[PDB]
Amino acid sequence: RDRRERRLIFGTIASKMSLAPEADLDSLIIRNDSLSGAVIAAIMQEAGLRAVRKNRYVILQSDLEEAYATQVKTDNTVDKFDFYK
């Protein structure tokens, strides 16, 4: 994948959701690397789960950061202690 190439996925799902003018959509395409469309779909949905958790119908910038902290686990491994060697 690529930083600006993944915008067609992150940005398309963002068009179907309510976002705030201060929400940063560039932070999702920087740290994330090589994600499938299904995993990306869970990122935007998790941001909405953080908005309803705060009793807000508009996704803020903090909800996009809290959604990434849950999605840091992509491959199936034990914490950061994997790759024994």
Add this chain to the structure above:
Amino acid sequence: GDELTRSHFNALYDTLLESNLCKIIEPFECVEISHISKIIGLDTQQVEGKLSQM
């Protein structure tokens, strides 16, 4: 200076006009042309030329 920008300039010129053309077409037709150019904001010859092209 850009040919691609001017090519899309007439695309929006007909797009923003179509949005203005749909404003006079929404009510009932058979009105005066002199009042049509006042609503759109262009000359009578310019409105009749672009509308007939569509």
Add this chain to the structure above:
Amino acid sequence: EGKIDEAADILCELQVETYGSMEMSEKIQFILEQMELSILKGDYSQATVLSRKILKKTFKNPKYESLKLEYYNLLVKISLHKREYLEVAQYLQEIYQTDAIKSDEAKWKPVLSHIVYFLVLSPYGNLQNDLIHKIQNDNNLKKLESQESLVKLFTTNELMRWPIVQKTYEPVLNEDDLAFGGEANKHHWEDLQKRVIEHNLRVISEYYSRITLLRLNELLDLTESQTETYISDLVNQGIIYAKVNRPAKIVNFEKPKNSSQLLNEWSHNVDELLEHIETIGHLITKEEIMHGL
């Protein structure tokens, strides 16, 4: 100390993360007061979001005295920035039955006038016909019959006496210090005049099939530039549809031609002769009994 924005920002940055949903007595009361700080601050979005939390939870909870009265005031105060008289009319359906059961007619009579104020100034809706009869009406009251006649006035209103009616009786109309706010009466005249024109063209189409545009302008109390504004708004918003001819100065109802002529409208010609065979059946029995004996 004279602080407005600072006083509201303190409670909004605390009460949200304070309560752990333990005691709802002090929580619900202070959230209703938290919306009051957003009113002085001027943020309609803060009060709108806070109104989606405890409002539905209060419905499941039993009715109280001081708690339920705060919802009726805040839902009216949020209409300053919203300026929508249709939504508030639905918010007053609970207080309409509250003052008629829990309270007495002392506080029920003025609120009855306010409910009509939001109905008269409502742009449109499907509940306007259901709000004509209501429940507790026909109580033999001067204020009840006066406000009820204004609902059906839109049919026969010529807009000739419209400025006269508001001046003679002005309970909710011109000078209203209850359930309203503002720096002048301009909000009363501008909002009411735009509605009575929209509600007038609705019944005119349902009655006059073809009317001259010159005579139509006298009924709307407008000019050539003002009349075309309300007509283009009702058609673009999908309210009503009619024919407007500027050069011909002829306004028509625009009867649909999709009825397929004799495939549908012919059903009216058979009902012309249909009732004969039924009435003859009743006459054959009755005629022979009275004439024979």
